[PDB]
Design a protein around this ligand. Sequence first.
Ligand code: CUZ
Ligand code: CUA
Ligand code: CUA
Ligand SMILES: [Ca+2]
Ligand SMILES: [Cl-]
Ligand SMILES: [Cl-]
Ligand SMILES: [K+]
Ligand code: NA
Ligand code: NA
Ligand SMILES: [Zn+2]
Ligand SMILES: [Zn+2]
Lengths: 586, 568
Amino acid sequence: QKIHVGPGELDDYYGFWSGGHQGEVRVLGVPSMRELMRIPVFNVDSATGWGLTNESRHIMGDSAKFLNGDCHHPHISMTDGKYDGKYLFINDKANSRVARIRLDIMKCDKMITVPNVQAIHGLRLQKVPHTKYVFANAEFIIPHPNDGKVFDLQDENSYTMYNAIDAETMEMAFQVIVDGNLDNTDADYTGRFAAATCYNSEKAFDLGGMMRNERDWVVVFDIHAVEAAVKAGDFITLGDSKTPVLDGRKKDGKDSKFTRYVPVPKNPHGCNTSSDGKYFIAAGKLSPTCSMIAIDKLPDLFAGKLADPRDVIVGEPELGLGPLHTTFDGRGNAYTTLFIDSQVVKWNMEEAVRAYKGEKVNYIKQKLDVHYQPGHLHASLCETNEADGKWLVALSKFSKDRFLPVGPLHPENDQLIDISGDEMKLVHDGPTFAEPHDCIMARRDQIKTKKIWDRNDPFFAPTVEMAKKDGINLDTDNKVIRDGNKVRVYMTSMAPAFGVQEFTVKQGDEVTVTITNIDQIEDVSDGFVVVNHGVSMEISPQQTSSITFVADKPGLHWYYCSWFCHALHMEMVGRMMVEPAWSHPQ
Amino acid sequence: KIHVGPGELDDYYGFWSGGHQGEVRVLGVPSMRELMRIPVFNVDSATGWGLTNESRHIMGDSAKFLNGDCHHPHISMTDGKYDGKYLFINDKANSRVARIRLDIMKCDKMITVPNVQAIHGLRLQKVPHTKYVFANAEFIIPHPNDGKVFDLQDENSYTMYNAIDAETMEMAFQVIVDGNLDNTDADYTGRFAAATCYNSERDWVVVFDIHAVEAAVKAGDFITLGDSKTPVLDGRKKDGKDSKFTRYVPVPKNPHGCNTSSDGKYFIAAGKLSPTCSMIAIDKLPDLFAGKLADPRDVIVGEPELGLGPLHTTFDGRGNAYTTLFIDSQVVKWNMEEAVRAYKGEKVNYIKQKLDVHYQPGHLHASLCETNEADGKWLVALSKFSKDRFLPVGPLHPENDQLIDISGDEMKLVHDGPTFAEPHDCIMARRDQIKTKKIWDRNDPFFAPTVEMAKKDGINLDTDNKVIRDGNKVRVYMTSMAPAFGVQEFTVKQGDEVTVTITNIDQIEDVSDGFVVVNHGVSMEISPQQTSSITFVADKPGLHWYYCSWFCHALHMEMVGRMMVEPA
Ligand code: CUZ
Ligand code: CUA
Ligand code: CUA
Ligand SMILES: [Ca+2]
Ligand SMILES: [Cl-]
Ligand SMILES: [Cl-]
Ligand SMILES: [K+]
Ligand code: NA
Ligand code: NA
Ligand SMILES: [Zn+2]
Ligand SMILES: [Zn+2]
């Protein structure tokens, strides 16, 4: 297996890294581990204007007021248990959002603030028959309503909820109230079942309180039951949200139609569906184990055919100190991070299952040291029935001395590991900024990107409609529209000339500049910066982009093209002239 | 030798401009891996730069801008060698210069350059040390720019060359020039600096007699512009008569790069539209300013013909120059002293090799090239169009930063490094030239204004966990020690303005903490022994969780707290 990609060779896989609390998504080539692109999501990006442009702020909605995000869990949409390359979804723990990225244009095209919850953490996608739902955990228990009269987490109306978002429309589909809280989640290979770990069955707010119970659980959701209750109108709504809300709590020990609670030690964390569809595997964290839930026993469990919820557990291998996450090679082996022991442990799932039946067998095949304190790990195509067993990335949280010193803040260490054979081999240390938690890999042939925009792309269709109200044809027009104290500049750009090279406004005018890059050539992006006004954005071929700012300073103000485009790139410039307020009314 | 395997360390630091994204990036060389991001003009969700009170204090009023446009990173020097103290960088978008402290890898000072638009070219005094940062303002504007005069040919429409005091990060002086400024460099004595100029067959490089500028400032022979106290000197020609501060050397044509050879002999201006570089002999500049030379062209001692679109030049310390050819898409290696002999008319081929790069190179940078220790080992060429060199990633493409081995007689291409938002230029330093702190100093100036605020409240930041009430303002102070915040709950009134100040009292390297207030747009870093603070308004009643964002401990998910907001 080639590990080094020389000049002129291409990577074999795409990698999509979460940006952690930096808030973006990063596109890597694997196995070189080089960053090919950054996709802004919850961050404000100076380069492309994401968070400054009207198109990006329209997608972010009211949450455009936040300049931060905290993303952990990127996942690729699936059809019949295989990646289909349409969408990537990712969470925001900081401001309780889910974002969707279109993989053809490599941009965030949709974003939703999940109603009536705090902190979207766990996120994964339905696998079968396709990604109809995005499943997302809200991690923190809050009052309902959270109006400041009740603060107690033990009140009967304090809880968190499991969230399902319609993947295609990016509107809420339903929410399920749960006992305890929610950490990570995954889905089966049928569409009926999803599952989430819980670490706060105690509903506590202190460290000792959250660690009291010897077992918390993984809560299993019967999605067919949930959908059936929605179609029946058997639901409530919270606050001003019309989202159907179903109650998955136990009441006096009697189970809900929608959930079952499988006791699992202890503050369990990762929740990972094996690629053969046989198991939900929960990592025991404070317990030196993983618990293997047999998905084929779940129908009977929900049908009352088992006496004890623990009867769906068919394995609980002892692996080492601080198991956090598990991934799969598609050869029947699982790979789990040990945060405390600072290792990845390779183990055989079927042999673990036989040991749980008392058959003394050594299911542990290898422990590999990693550097240091691994969190997530990801094997290539592990989330699909095509899991290919070639590459493994372990994402470690302390790099210590593995890289040159760079001051008190250190990089993370995302280590590439060859698992194509019986022996795991560490091949590359990848330093990264701001804690990627998880990543996801796709084959080169599973991702198809556009090279030039379609003029009808929904990303800027609202801007096209604004232009139409002004009688503007964006592919041709270079015009300044005046409207009271609003000025709407429309121009084409064809390097090295802006189609409008100067325009005049009154001090205090609200100026919108809309630029349509009518170039037809690949890799010729234009840019637009207004000097000393905090204005910057990208305009790629056939894209329309727009930005709005106040001309608060009298005088002459230069604008220029930022994205290098030409040998005469230094000279693609223009001038905004701002007449002083004292020469105009009031 | 280019492979840095697991457990092995890079030999050099690379400091990459963040381009239109606004940050500075620290790379390991030769692996070309990104070790750290240093936020400067961008708002960084991870560390809170642009959100925290410490960062917004450094940014000043320019904290209102969320963008920057970076190009030209340079490291401070003592005796013509990197001293590892500071990195400086430009902001073309909002006309700023920022200083980065290389011991903490943070931006610690920032200035908006008065009465100019767009800081682009930037380089440092070399000798006797980096007393001044020299910065080009690119665009001609009216003076004053108050909306009465828009005419760019007006006698009071011009741009200026800028000198910033490197140590105080206050303006030192400004010099009015004819034309537009492009790039700039400085000599190895401190007397001279030079810049290419591209407005008005032939443009020029303007040479500054900094000694003459300094003498005028000290005698009070200057004006000021607007409400800035910056001394302003007039370096324009007047009725064909020269300033005492400047000489204009004719150089073809729309010249671009302006690079000082590491032997100190030449300012080398890249010809761009002319397939040449022009070599200005620095040892002839005293005679030029003394009126001893018949013609400003007499300081030109070489004009090698190199190829189509020369843009920038760097040096191996062995006597060779390396120049990017933007149109031919190559790096050309040539011998400077042989070029000088050719200019006198000898038949001698000064061109040694042309190496194809991919594609359209702009800046290039050889290791230690800006110092008299230029070591001839590594060369990075930064190319604008990566085309098919990397996997496709949609309509936007990465820059291709290519690593080239120049240690022997033949340049060898060894690595293609894709980068985001057109870094444009970079600088390298030996590992042993950079010395960084493992943990913060409690007296560090970076958070000294916060320590002062704490003092007024009677707070010992190293020990206290206290909530101060002051009208509708609430100032929370706490220590943090993974996995526990020192204040785990507090209660305020709806509408209160809450400041949270956190001191990480861990002493273990790499155990950084974070602080995020859910659904309030609040995020920041607190590394070992740092104090960080952030201010927000509690505009939502109810219970609102806060949590640690930096994975710090097996119990990281559980390092949380509660803010309770009583309805108005
Ligand atoms: Cu958010 S948690 Cu193990 Cu995923 Cu990092
Ligand atoms: Cu268009 Cu530079
Ligand atoms: Cu403190 Cu994570
Ligand atoms: Ca628990
Ligand atoms: Cl997980
Ligand atoms: Cl230069
Ligand atoms: K870390
Ligand atoms: Na939305
Ligand atoms: Na300042
Ligand atoms: Zn440059
Ligand atoms: Zn240049």
